[PDB]
């Protein structure tokens, strides 16, 4: 019985691989050959946002490209005014083992989580003039590695129980559960339309989910080690994955296989965070070697280096308006690059 | 700067003051991490995340355990890792030894010391003296090993030698391992962690200075 099912699975996998192999007529590297190279970009730090007394594990911009929230091991979220370096809010946390950090698009809420397996939503714009928990979202069996806000009432969380979940914050219960990963889901990017989302796990597989129907539409597997970061291209038809293999790869949703590999002979360290620009031409990647690299997304060449951290770059973010990049390292500082 | 902006700056400075206050209060305590597979007596050494307080000689200690291949990265700033082994169950002692090899050689613990406790050394005596079980059945190197009751002692030094031998292989001196034979009724376990922590903090102090 099980032998027949496994044989059918092997036939299905061979059919998938043959289906993709027919579509790969001409490589993106060949098509991208005759465009103007971006040259060197020299983005210097403009701000340094000190005040954290531990390693920064996550951060997230606001929708207005003006505010951002950062979580560290001192058990505190700090909401920064990036324009003036002012601290707008300091939110103490019940558990100091935070791994993720989310800012709601409306800006009324923030979310953090980690080894305590609970997503916590904080009400920022309240009477009484303080920040307080509105809801603790329990139900994951493992640690939370990412969480992104669909809206004020919906949030999606990736976890180390091999499962992603979607919640109704008002009711505080798992509306839909996304299952199919075999390793720990490490990164979770939400699509610009908030109808699909792509997740990267420790099994070197990236999976595409439909938020509504709760189904794994496509599975992408090219990496050799765990995927640590994942981010949609602004178009919404592609995404970039960074892994511990010291490699970033660009996957297309419609072609349904890898497009480009961003690797260099020197890089040996794992990739910690991936972000795009507004136009999608640059691919900011945070590395374990305590600096970031700017890859030309189309031509696959290091266009620059962001070297200002004396410990590993753990997070990375780019504003909606595209003015500034943020990097946060285990050195307790986060810098705004332009 | 406008009046609004000046007042916001004042608020930020107050947040800053509270942040250093919390940082000092946090620095006054030492962070640990308790590891061990199961059936090892983890919870009885000092008698999703379970945190336990305890203080010896007016030093705040704060252990954590979980209920590992990826989240160990969080515990890279811990003072020491406490690894626990059940030394009375030789059926799965090699699993424990491989686990120690994994934690010892992990990339993010290259400067983190490990404190070994070999629990149920009170049952190791019974198992060895009874004669029902035999180390040489599992570990061949036992019958050709002699210590540098007698044979229970030689056995328990054999296990310790295995663990310290994995420790020495690639320590490079940046971090070391501290073995301790312990029981369930043994009380002097916070004192062992205290003394080992003094040793580790001495190494760290001598290392911020580029000396050790």
């Amino acid at each position, epitope marked *: 019985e099980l032998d027949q099912l496994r044989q059918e699975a092997e036939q299905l996998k061979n059919q998938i691989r043959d289906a993709r192999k027919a579509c790969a007529d001409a490589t993106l590297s060949q098509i991208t050959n005759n465009i103007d190279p971006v040259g060197r970009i020299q983005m210097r730090t403009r701000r340094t946002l000190r005040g954290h007394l531990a390693k920064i594990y996550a951060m997230h911009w606001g929708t207005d490209s*003006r505010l951002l929230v950062s979580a560290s091991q001192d058990g505190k979220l700090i909401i920064w*005014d990036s324009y003036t370096t*002012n601290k707008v809010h300091a939110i103490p946390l019940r558990s100091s083992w935070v791994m993720t950090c989310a800012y709601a698009p409306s800006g009324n809420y923030v979310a953090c989580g980690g080894l305590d397996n609970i997503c916590s939503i904080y009400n920022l714009k309240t009477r*009484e*003039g303080n920040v307080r928990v509105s809801r603790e979202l329990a139900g994951h069996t493992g640690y939370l590695s990412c969480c992104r806000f669909l809206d004020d009432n919906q949030i999606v969380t990736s976890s180390g129980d091999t499962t992603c979940a979607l919640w109704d914050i008002e009711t505080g219960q798992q509306t839909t559960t996304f299952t199919g990963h075999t390793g720990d889901v490490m990164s979770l990017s939400l699509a610009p339309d908030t109808r699909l989302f792509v997740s990267g796990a420790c099994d070197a597989s990236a999976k595409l989910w439909d938020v509504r129907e709760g189904m794994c539409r496509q599975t992408f597997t090219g990496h050799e080690s765990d995927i640590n970061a994942i981010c949609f291209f602004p178009n919404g038809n592609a995404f970039a994955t960074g892994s511990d293999d010291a490699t970033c790869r660009l996957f297309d949703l419609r072609a349904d296989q890898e497009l480009m590999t961003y690797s260099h002979d020197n890089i040996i360290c794992g990739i910690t965070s991936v972000s795009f620009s507004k136009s999608g031409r640059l691919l900011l990647a945070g590395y374990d070697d305590f600096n970031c690299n700017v890859w030309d997304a189309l031509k696959a060449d290091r266009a620059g280096v962001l070297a200002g951290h004396d410990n590993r770059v753990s997070c990375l973010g780019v504003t909606d308006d595209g003015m500034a990049v943020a990097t946060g390292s285990w050195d307790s500082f986060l810098k705004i690059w332009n | 700067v*406008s009046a*609004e902006d000046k*007042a916001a700056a*004042e608020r930020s400075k*107050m947040i800053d003051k509270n942040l250093r206050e919390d940082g000092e209060k946090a620095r006054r305590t030492l962070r640990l991490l308790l590891l061990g597979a199961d059936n090892s007596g983890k919870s009885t050494i000092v008698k999703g995340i379970f945190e336990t307080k305890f203080q010896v000689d007016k030093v705040n200690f704060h252990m954590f355990d979980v209920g590992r291949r990826k989240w160990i990265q969080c515990f890279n700033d811990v003072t020491a890792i406490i690894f626990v082994v059940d030394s009375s169950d030789y059926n799965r002692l090699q699993e424990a030894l491989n686990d120690f090899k994994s934690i010892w050689n992990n990339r993010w613990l290259r400067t983190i010391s490990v404190i070994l406790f070999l629990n149920k050394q009170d049952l190791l005596a019974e198992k060895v003296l009874a004669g029902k079980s035999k180390i040489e059945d599992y570990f061949p190197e036992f019958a050709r090993y002699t210590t540098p009751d007698p044979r229970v002692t030689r056995a328990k030094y054999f296990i310790r030698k295995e663990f310290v031998d994995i420790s020495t292989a690639s320590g490079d001196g940046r971090h070391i391992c501290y073995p301790h034979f312990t029981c369930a009724v043994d009380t002097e376990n916070a004192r062992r962690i205290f003394n080992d922590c003094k040793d580790i903090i001495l190494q760290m102090n001598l290392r911020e200075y580029n000396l050790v």
Partner: single-chain antibody
Amino acid sequence: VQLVESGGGLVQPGGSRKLSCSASGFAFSSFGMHWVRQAPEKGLEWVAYISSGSGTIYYADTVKGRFTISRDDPKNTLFLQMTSLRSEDTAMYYCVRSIYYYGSSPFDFWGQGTTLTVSSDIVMTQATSSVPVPGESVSISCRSSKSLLHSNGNTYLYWFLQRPGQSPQLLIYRMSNLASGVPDRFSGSGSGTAFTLTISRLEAEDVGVYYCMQHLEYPLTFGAGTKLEL
């Protein structure tokens, strides 16, 4: 949220009194507190200012030297000690909370004041002292001595509604933003030294005196007041 003021009474000229504001229902230590008085038949006038953490103190020129403002954070109490009281100090002293971070809403909650009876600076102009006008639309204007537009893109104009026999209520902060609870019919617009506050579908419980306050720099100055009567 509740600011309940105390003190008050008939005071002989030259005497001294202390007014006490008792906060309840909000994080009082993280709020900067103002004192604003209103003469029996006049507009609103700023008096004092205690900052969060009591770091910064600002007084009005009229009360500079003979007034003292201080807060007791553990007791959640705000104080106004004032000696050498004069016949120009007869007013209902309102206690005001204000918090200052990015995107905040200062001057959002006012207390029920206590009446005390004693037996350069930017000028705000609100010309239409009384506009007679239900279900229609009205516009209320305000002017300034200097452009209230700061270099950081913020135009610091505020709007207040004083319902009859009630403490004034914030409507608009920074000439565009509606407060927490005001109906969406209100809206403010304007430029430097040119301001307006338009209302649509004017209703009941909606008529009073509309004050425009500047917050560009101290001392904070109000308008005379535009009144809407049905």
